[PDB]
Ligand binder design. Structure first.
Ligand SMILES: CCCCCCCCCCCCCCCCCC(=O)O[C@H](COC(=O)CCCCCCCCCCCCCCC)COP(=O)(O)OCC[N+](C)(C)C
Ligand SMILES: CCCCCCCCCCCCCCCCCC(=O)O[C@H](COC(=O)CCCCCCCCCCCCCCC)COP(=O)(O)OCC[N+](C)(C)C
Ligand SMILES: C/C(=C\Cc1c(C)c(O)c2ccccc2c1O)CCC[C@H](C)CCC[C@H](C)CCCC(C)C
Ligand SMILES: *[C@@H]1O[C@H](CO)[C@@H](O[C@@H]2O[C@H](CO)[C@@H](O)[C@H](O)[C@H]2NC(C)=O)[C@H](O)[C@H]1NC(C)=O
Ligand SMILES: *[C@@H]1O[C@H](CO)[C@@H](O[C@@H]2O[C@H](CO)[C@@H](O)[C@H](O)[C@H]2NC(C)=O)[C@H](O)[C@H]1NC(C)=O
Ligand SMILES: *[C@@H]1O[C@H](CO)[C@@H](O[C@@H]2O[C@H](CO)[C@@H](O)[C@H](O)[C@H]2NC(C)=O)[C@H](O)[C@H]1NC(C)=O
Ligand SMILES: *[C@@H]1O[C@H](CO)[C@@H](O)[C@H](O)[C@H]1NC(C)=O
Lengths: 35, 693
């Protein structure tokens, strides 16, 4: 990651604790497919 | 003759002295079952190398020139360049083929073993139990004489064609499988497995549909999913050994493994376990199976004659045991003792200890803890100017297991320390703030957010001083919280938080999240709004309406941890949904013949369905069209016959294999004949990625 936009965040967008949703049950025993 | 001798296969007097023990562990036995297991293990690892080990993805994981943070077990180890890594995986494939066909067995076993562990130790984020098991089996099979029956090496050497093998070859494998089952069972005697919390949502799969005819969903998720697993683990440990219980054990174990294969994405673990299950049968089952065939098949299948004498066994007449027999007996005893001890060796390596025990992979604690992360904040302070900034949570990383282990956090901090000077930051101080909950508890911090991880102290054999304890006293609250989870509308959402004394949480509610409220469940907290610098102390059962679009802070000011909750709804999504419903109602009214009046021009694109020769649609129209298209696509996906799905699956796997092979060939050519011009490389790489069709 480069361009100084994927390696830095502003204050307000880095402290947003609550995010709405419309993994949460990861077991660490599952191979994650990539392609 | 003695019943104990018949059941256990050996007499007590055989263990009176060391020499008798060596003779017992080196007695003759048939080689057939070992050969079949060798073949199946080799075939499965051959299929597994291009899929899970990462040969297809190796061109985007160890890419040259990319700056990434690695997580190796030892800091000395570093990846080689890409081409040499492809060569290493080629050697792995050749070793697996050699093990499958039994051609140059020891060399093939070594060529599979050494690269596999090199790759395994190079990254701790790719560790899982089914990989450690494969490594251990490859380590074991290097010493066993598994090429004596149904092997190419037999055809090339008469002395090793249908010959005897020592008994400890079977004993080590049987002990390994028994240890796996039994340790998995005993590890699952935890409060979060016997009470129904781990894997609480796996009872909704359609494979459990028949059980619902006689049991409710709540009971089906406890008696069958949880207790059944524990009982099957222990019993499958014990049942297969004895002759009386082998049939029922095989049936239950096979059903268990097939269901695990369908439910999860573990990979080849279930098939390897299925192949290992027959190993408890009599050592001569393939021979009698070959006998029970027509003569035409016998002309192609392996030999059916009795095995010949070998040189790696002690024969009773007597024969004085040599050196290899004693080494085999010692290896068996010491290896089994080490396998018993290692899963419980977490009191020595306390640096790797956390809320759970040790690094994942070598404990057999499968599907016993589930984690849900809420937020990850990484702060940095520059050592020259004093500026304070925030980094992206997962920059310069490929896996997300660094949020739960201290050592990986230390390695990530050092990597960031060496890499940030490229982006105009001097010697920094980096702080981490990570929230995580295990098995649906209150979300609490895992590392102290006031400690510079770059200068923190960590050694493997001492306890880490900056890992917050797991507050297990709030475990029963998971009952009440669930009730609160079921009292909400279809729009409202709830997040539960438990915070330590002294610390504070600073939060920025987004402008979209209107109607956000904070309620206190236990303890004493103070909520501060910085817009006017006003702080209020909240007592038990008090609720406050937070501002939307500003900063607020919550401080804990009690001798004990404080538990509270955020209840919020998204106003923007609600308004958009109302407008979308109104637009759909207007469309339906137009369609059914009502609303005879002319449609507005903004509605005309909706009926037309295509933006051609007109003004660009408003965001609402674009959103409606996108939602309709997505719903239609999902509906089309659902109405797909089985054969098409199977064909697509096969084509995708063929694509993976073809890409792996072509990339490996390109890498080997680059190593041997040198690197051609960039245009030729681009053409070859483009040809490699092409879909089969
Ligand atoms: C001076 C030093 C004195 C000696 C000190 C060290 C003593 C060590 C004793 C422990 C090790 C003993 C190894 C014995 C090897 C042995 O018996 O191997 C095998 C047994 O295989 C194993 O190694 C078993 C692995 C563990 C599996 C779980 C066993 C559960 C036992 C439950 C309690 C009984 C004999 O098999 P067989 O072909 O004769 O078939 C017998 C069973 N049937 C026919 C039913 C399938
Ligand atoms: C004595 C015997 C004792 C009993 C032993 C029993 C066990 C033996 C096992 C032997 C191995 C059998 C094959 C295993 C295949 C296998 O594992 O299947 C697969 C993996 O294997 C494969 O897919 C192999 C595919 C190989 C490629 C085949 C290509 C064939 C092409 C045919 C021609 C097509 C022509 C088209 C144009 C006309 C599992 O997939 P996954 O892990 O990604 O699972 C996805 C779905 N979930 C996650 C939900 C589970
Ligand atoms: C997910 C489960 C266990 C985790 C697991 C996995 C994934 C493995 O790969 C293992 C491999 C070897 C050793 C242990 C492993 C392991 O622990 C329980 C799965 C529960 C199952 C699907 C429910 C069916 C239970 C039995 C078969 C039926 C009993 C029903 C009534 C008759 C009582
Ligand atoms: C915001 O406040 C809460 C959610 O944060 C919700 O209000 C509820 O108000 C309705 C009004 O009839 C009650 O029936 C519910 O029982 C309330 N829910 C509770 C108390 O949890 C609603 O999402 C928003 N309400 C307003 C007025 O904006
Ligand atoms: C609101 O109340 C909080 C309660 O802690 C005050 O916080 C402390 O803030 C002072 C500086 O104002 C620090 O020196 C203390 O260390 C803080 N205490 C803790 C426990 O963190 C806060 O200052 C108050 N705000 C206003 C505007 O009066
Ligand atoms: C709150 O709800 C809104 C509803 O729009 C969510 O918004 C979308 O947010 C994503 C980014 O997460 C944007 O790219 C989309 O354009 C938004 N949709 C629109 C404008 O229709 C939003 O993510 C939710 N969460 C927060 C924190 O605002
Ligand atoms: C500032 O950072 C950017 C990104 O690397 C680049 O302009 C340069 O490295 C830095 N320039 C100065 C003057 O520090």
């Amino acid at each position: 990651e480069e361009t100084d936009q994927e390696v830095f965040l502003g204050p307000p967008e880095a402290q947003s604790f609550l995010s709405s949703h419309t993994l949460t049950e990861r077991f660490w025993e599952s191979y994650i497919y990539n392609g | 003759d003695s019943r104990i001798g018949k059941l256990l296969g050996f007499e007590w007097t055989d263990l009176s002295s060391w020499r008798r023990l060596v003779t017992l562990l080196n007695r003759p036995t048939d080689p057939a079952s070992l050969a079949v297991f060798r073949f199946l293990f080799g075939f499965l690892m051959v299929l597994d190398i291009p899929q899970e080990r990462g040969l297809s993805s190796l061109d985007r994981k160890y890419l040259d020139g990319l700056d990434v943070c690695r997580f190796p077990l030892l800091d000395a180890l570093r990846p080689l360049p890409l081409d040499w890594m492809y060569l290493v995986y080629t050697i792995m494939f050749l070793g697996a083929l050699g093990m499958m066909l039994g051609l140059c067995y020891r060399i093939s076993c070594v060529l599979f073993l050494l690269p596999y562990w090199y790759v395994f130790l190079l990254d701790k984020t790719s560790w899982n139990n089914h990989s450690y098991l494969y490594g251990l089996l490859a380590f074991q099979l290097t010493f066993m004489d598994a090429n004596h029956y149904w092997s190419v090496d037999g055809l090339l050497n008469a002395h090793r064609r249908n010959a005897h093998v020592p008994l400890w070859n079977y004993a080590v494998l049987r002990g390994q499988i028994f240890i796996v089952y039994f340790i998995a069972g005993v590890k699952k005697l935890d409060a979060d497995w016997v009470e129904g919390y781990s894997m609480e949502y796996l009872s909704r799969h359609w494979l459990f549909s028949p059980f619902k005819l006689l049991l409710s969903e709540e009971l089906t998720s406890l008696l069958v999913v949880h207790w059944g697993g524990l009982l099957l683990d222990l019993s499958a440990g014990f049942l297969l050994f004895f002759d009386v219980s082998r049939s029922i054990g095989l049936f239950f174990v096979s059903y268990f493994h097939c269901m695990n294969s369908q439910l999860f994405s573990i990979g080849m673990f279930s098939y390897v376990m299925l192949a290992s299950s027959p190993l408890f049968c009599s050592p001569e089952w393939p021979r009698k199976l070959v006998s029970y065939c027509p003569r035409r098949l016998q002309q192609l299948l392996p030999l059916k004659a009795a095995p010949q004498p070998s040189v790696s066994c002690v024969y009773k007449r007597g024969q004085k045991p040599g050196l290899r027999h004693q080494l085999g007996a010692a290896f068996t005893l010491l290896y089994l003792l080490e396998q018993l001890f290692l899963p419980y060796s977490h009191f020595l390596t306390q640096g790797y200890n956390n809320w759970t025990n040790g690094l994942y992979g070598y404990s057999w604690d499968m599907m016993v803890h589930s984690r849900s992360h809420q937020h990850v904040k990484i702060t940095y302070r520059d050592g020259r100017t004093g500026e304070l900034g925030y980094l992206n949570p997962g920059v310069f990383t490929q896996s997300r297991r660094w949020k739960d282990h201290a050592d990986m956090l230390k390695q990530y901090a050092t990597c960031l320390s060496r890499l940030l000077p490229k982006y105009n930051v001097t010697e920094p101080q980096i702080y981490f703030d990570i929230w995580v909950s295990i098995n649906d508890r209150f979300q609490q911090r895992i590392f102290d957010p006031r400690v510079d991880i770059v200068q923190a102290a960590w050694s493997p054999f001492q306890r880490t001083s900056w890992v917050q304890p797991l507050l297990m006293d709030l475990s029963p609250w998971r009952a009440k919280l669930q009730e609160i989870k079921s009292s909400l509308d279809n729009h409202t959402e709830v997040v539960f938080i438990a915070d330590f004394p002294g610390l504070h949480l600073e939060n920025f509610v987004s402008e979209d999240l209107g109607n956000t409220s904070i309620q206190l469940l236990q303890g004493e907290v103070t909520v501060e709004l910085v817009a006017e610098q006003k702080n209020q102390t909240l007592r038990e059962g008090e609720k406050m309406q937070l501002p939307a679009g500003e900063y607020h802070k919550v401080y804990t000011t009690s001798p004990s941890p404080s538990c509270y909750m955020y209840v919020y709804v998204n106003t923007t999504e609600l308004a958009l949904e109302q407008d979308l419903a109104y637009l759909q109602e207007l469309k339906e009214k137009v369609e059914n013949g009502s609303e005879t009046g002319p449609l507005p021009p903004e509605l005309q694109p909706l009926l037309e369905g295509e933006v051609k020769g007109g003004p660009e649609p408003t965001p609402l129209v674009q959103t409606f069209l996108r939602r309709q298209q997505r719903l239609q696509e999902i509906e089309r996906r659902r109405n797909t016959p089985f054969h098409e799905r199977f064909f697509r699956f096969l084509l995708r796997k063929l694509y993976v294999f073809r890409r792996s092979f072509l990339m490996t060939c390109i890498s080997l050519r680059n190593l041997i004949l040198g690197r051609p011009s960039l245009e030729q490389l681009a053409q070859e790489v483009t040809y490699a990625n092409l879909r089969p069709f």
